[PDB]
Amino acid sequence: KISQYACQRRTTLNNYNQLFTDALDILAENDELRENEGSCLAFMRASSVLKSLPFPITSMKDTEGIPCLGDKVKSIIEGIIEDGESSEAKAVLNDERYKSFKLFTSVFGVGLKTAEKWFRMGFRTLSKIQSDKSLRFTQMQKAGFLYYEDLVSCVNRPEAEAVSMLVKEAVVTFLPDALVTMTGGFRRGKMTGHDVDFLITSPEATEDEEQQLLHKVTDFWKQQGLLLYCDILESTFEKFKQPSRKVDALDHFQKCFLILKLDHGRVHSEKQEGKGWKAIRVDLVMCPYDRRAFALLGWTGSRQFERDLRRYATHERKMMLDNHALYDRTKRVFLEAESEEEIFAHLGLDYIEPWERNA
Ligand SMILES: Nc1ncnc2c1ncn2[C@@H]1O[C@H](COP(=O)(O)CP(=O)(O)OP(=O)(O)O)[C@@H](O)[C@H]1O
Ligand SMILES: [Mg+2]
Ligand SMILES: [Mg+2]
């Protein structure tokens, strides 16, 4: 019996139901844009459970016993079985507001509010936005437009590995005992990503050394001429605060959102061609050593896997989980973990491998 929780399912990248889930992902994204949080959640949970199936749906009988498939979702599945297409998802793909939101938020530094503002101003293309003489752009958006073609092309595994080498070389220069781990999509086995994410931790660094590392590493890259964009968010981490009760838990660790200049010579791929370098989005997170397993688990994702992990912890175990800690409300104790496996064992869950968290 398939669990309603993604954290009790193994979801690998061999999706046999992409015809259904691509349509459900589009419908979920449109509900996010139309501020319909409820309908968005229902389509996300349905899409997530179909991604876990070891076989393709070929008839309505195949949906029997599958949880998170409401009447609205089953009508969409029925229509795709009928014609090979979703008329509902097709209408969203042709919707002017949806097309504009997807196009505008494809720019680094552009969120829902700015995308909505530009749409209501009558903008429909990035060319008309960039060349406008009255518009004022944030420093984030300026970088988003300047490095647009590189950022919109997918980061591949040779590029992610080349970035990992750069991160490790910079980090060990200031903290030689530091542990650097690639997280996000690439840790889940993806071939491509929009960015490359890393978790950095040090067993012997002080509170001040931990705070200064991201400033030292980015100043080093600025000196090398590799820092194209940099935004460092200081830590708001509280060692003894209870974990978040929120559906989407906020991360309080020190972090930075970067754009790095990746020279072609550093990339060992099958394939100089153009300018000789590529702009790469990189996120770095620094966490205290004792919280490394919670941070790794939170930053590995997927977003749906994290949501269900926290929901399961609260509703089934009366535990509070976030990226910083695990608290047991019955025992009235914080639970320690040196690995992700120990977190899963505390929660009474079978261990799910990172490549099985693609919910
Ligand atoms: N502010 C934040 N707080 C908590 N977790 C976060 C976070 N930002 C990102 N994450 C987590 O870190 C993982 C990597 O984040 P992202 O880079 O935003 C998406 P991804 O799953 O890696 O695919 P992608 O980078 O190709 O789009 C996510 O799967 C999510 O669980
Ligand atoms: Mg990522
Ligand atoms: Mg990221």
Ligand code: NA
């Ligand atoms: Na954006």
